[PDB]
Amino acid sequence: PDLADLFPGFGSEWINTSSGRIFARVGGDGPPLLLLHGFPQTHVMWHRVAPKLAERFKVIVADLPGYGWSDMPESDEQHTPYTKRAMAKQLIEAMEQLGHVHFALAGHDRGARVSYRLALDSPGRLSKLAVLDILPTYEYWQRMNRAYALKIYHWSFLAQPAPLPENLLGGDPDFYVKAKLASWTRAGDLSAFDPRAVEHYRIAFADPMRRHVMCEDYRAGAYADFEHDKIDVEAGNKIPVPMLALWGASGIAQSAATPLDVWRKWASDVQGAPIESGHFLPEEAPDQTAEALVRFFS
Amino acid sequence: DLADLFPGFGSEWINTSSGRIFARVGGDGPPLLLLHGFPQTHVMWHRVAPKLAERFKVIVADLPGYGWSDMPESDEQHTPYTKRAMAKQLIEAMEQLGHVHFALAGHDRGARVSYRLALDSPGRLSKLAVLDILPTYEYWQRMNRAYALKIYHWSFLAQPAPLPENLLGGDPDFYVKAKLASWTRAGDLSAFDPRAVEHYRIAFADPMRRHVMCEDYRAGAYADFEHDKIDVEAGNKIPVPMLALWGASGIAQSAATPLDVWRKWASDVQGAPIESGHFLPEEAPDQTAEALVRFFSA
Ligand SMILES: [Cl-]
Numbered sequence: 001p002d003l004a005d006l007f008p009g010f011g012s013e014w015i016n017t018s019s020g021r022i023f024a025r026v027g028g029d030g031p032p033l034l035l036l037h038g039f040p041q042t043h044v045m046w047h048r049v050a051p052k053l054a055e056r057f058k059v060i061v062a063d064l065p066g067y068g069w070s071d072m073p074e075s076d077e078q079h080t081p082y083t084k085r086a087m088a089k090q091l092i093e094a095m096e097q098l099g100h101v102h103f104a105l106a107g108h109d110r111g112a113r114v115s116y117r118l119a120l121d122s123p124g125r126l127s128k129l130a131v132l133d134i135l136p137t138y139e140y141w142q143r144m145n146r147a148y149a150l151k152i153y154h155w156s157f158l159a160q161p162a163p164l165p166e167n168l169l170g171g172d173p174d175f176y177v178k179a180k181l182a183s184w185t186r187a188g189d190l191s192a193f194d195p196r197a198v199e200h201y202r203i204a205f206a207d208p209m210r211r212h213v214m215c216e217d218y219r220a221g222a223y224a225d226f227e228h229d230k231i232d233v234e235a236g237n238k239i240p241v242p243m244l245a246l247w248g249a250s251g252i253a254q255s256a257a258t259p260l261d262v263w264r265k266w267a268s269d270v271q272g273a274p275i276e277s278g279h280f281l282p283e284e285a286p287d288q289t290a291e292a293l294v295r296f297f298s
Numbered sequence: 299d300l301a302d303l304f305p306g307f308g309s310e311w312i313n314t315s316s317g318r319i320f321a322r323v324g325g326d327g328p329p330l331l332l333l334h335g336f337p338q339t340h341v342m343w344h345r346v347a348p349k350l351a352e353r354f355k356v357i358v359a360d361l362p363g364y365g366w367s368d369m370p371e372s373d374e375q376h377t378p379y380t381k382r383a384m385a386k387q388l389i390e391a392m393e394q395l396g397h398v399h400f401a402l403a404g405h406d407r408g409a410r411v412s413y414r415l416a417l418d419s420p421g422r423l424s425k426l427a428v429l430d431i432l433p434t435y436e437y438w439q440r441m442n443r444a445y446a447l448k449i450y451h452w453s454f455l456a457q458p459a460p461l462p463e464n465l466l467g468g469d470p471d472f473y474v475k476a477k478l479a480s481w482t483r484a485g486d487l488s489a490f491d492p493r494a495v496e497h498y499r500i501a502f503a504d505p506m507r508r509h510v511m512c513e514d515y516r517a518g519a520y521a522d523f524e525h526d527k528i529d530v531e532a533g534n535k536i537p538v539p540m541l542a543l544w545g546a547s548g549i550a551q552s553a554a555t556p557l558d559v560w561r562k563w564a565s566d567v568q569g570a571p572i573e574s575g576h577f578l579p580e581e582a583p584d585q586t587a588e589a590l591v592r593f594f595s596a
């Protein structure tokens with residue numbers, strides 16, 4: 001339907017991979033910088049920061065596998081294509097299609113999970129890594145308590161076996177996506193968002209298959225993603241890529257643990273700063289987020 | 299067209315300051331109050347209550363807000379659906395019947411009212427039996443990844459209104475049937491009398507009733523937990539002789555060894571597992587009934 005182009009001047013690319021197409025907006029010139037969104041959003045969440053990044057970088061703003069307009073690989077009982085390991089492999093393959101075998105990467109939310117998993121699996125692929133408002137999946141599950149269970153209830157809700165979350169999400173999908181967007185902002189409403197961006201999120205979320213993928217992602221988040229992280233924790237594997245951890249002063253990551261302290265256990269070279277924002281750093285605090293990312297990546 | 303599942307039981311609408319309590323009443327002898335839980339109504343006792351009625355005056359009540367009991371208006375603290383409030387309301391209901399001292403068996407939410415009744419008002423109870431629960435405090439305190447996945451609904455249903463209400467309203471039937479099925483040993487509805495399922499489904503079909511259940515769960519995440527916390531940290535133990543029954547495949551045994559937990563909460567607790575999922579009186583009626591009769595009797 002009525003979907004605004006929020007990346008004027010960016011091209012739109014369908015990048016083929018062995019697991020399906022990745023949709024991306026591509027703008028800018030210079031070193032490649034891949035931007036990955038998370039839930040329940042699409043690549044358009046970068047629309048306020050991408051132009052500023054594209055002043056200095058070839059900015060590739062990709063829909064995650066299964067999200068947005070990217071193809072949805074068929075899942076399996078292990079949710080394999082929606083594990084962050086598989087998504088990272090698919091995005092690596094997509095970047096290779098562009099000739100980008102060494103790139104900068106900033107991820108937000110699920111996209112940040114892809115990113116740090118990418119950085120653990122294939123750190124050679126990354127010059128620099130920024131993660132916005134997450135802790136590693138293992139840390140969320142390790143710190144799981146009453147308070148976090150309530151706060152990130154959707155981690156266990158969306159990970160319920162199908163079709164339970166699918167059916168429930170189906171009961172009022174517009175409400176649910178708006179409810180997630182609003183409830184994780186500082187304002188608590190949709191006012192931080194561009195209505196046209198919210199329109200993108202609403203439409204993607206209106207598709208049952210897209211919602212199923214999101215549950216697949218969360219199922220992976222509860223199962224294989226956790227196991228993969230656990231392996232790294234237990235082997236002492238650290239991200240060797242210089243990395244920036246940004247978190248909302250009232251985002252999700254500061255609810256579980258002090259994020260820079262946490263990320264320092266996961267990464268050898270991490271800097272970090274809070275942004276006066278809820279979860280949606282690039283939309284609630286675009287100038288601050290864009291500034292931090294530009295300074296770090298450039 | 300809801301079946302009478304208690305042939306020969308009377309029906310009582312018991313006035314309390316907080317609304318009427320519906321109950322079926324049958325039998326003669328010492329009063330025994332049976333309290334159901336979620337997402338059920340008093341009819342879950344229909345297989346065991348006749349055996350109990352051979353020896354006790356059996357009062358099979360709908361919890362405040364459940365079944366045909368009135369639905370006191372909730373508030374921001376979910377007060378009427380805290381187990382403390384529900385217990386005080388059922389104390390008043392029993393008082394209306396002249397029962398100021400009575401035996402009590404509860405299942406699920408009803409078990410939570412029960413042990414809270416026993417902590418708050420121990421002198422009202424001759425004996426207490428709780429079925430397939432641990433204290434609310436213990437469930438939250440043990441809320442790790444595994445358990446957050448198992449009883450995700452503890453955090454989902456406790457989300458602020460109207461999020462769960464809105465999701466549940468799209469297809470209520472699905473969710474009540476899913477919960478009944480998922481917590482049984484068999485993982486389907488075969489343990490239930492279909493006429494009982496229809497009671498549960500009809501209750502669940504009312505949005506107000508569904509809201510009450512969420513209010514119960516909200517109370518469960520907040521006030522109920524706080525009240526329990528006070529008691530645990532104060533070393534307040536239930537003094538009333540108590541039977542803890544749980545399903546070998548039920549929920550309680552997922553968190554911890556139930557008897558060891560209950561021994562922390564109760565000075566005089568005996569416990570037996572029953573080969574059953576969560577729905578002991580329906581999955582394992584003869585065994586449950588025998589356990590209760592034995593325990594409550596001389
Ligand atoms: Cl790993």
Ligand SMILES: [Cl-]
Binds near residue numbers: 491492494
């Ligand atoms: Cl039944």
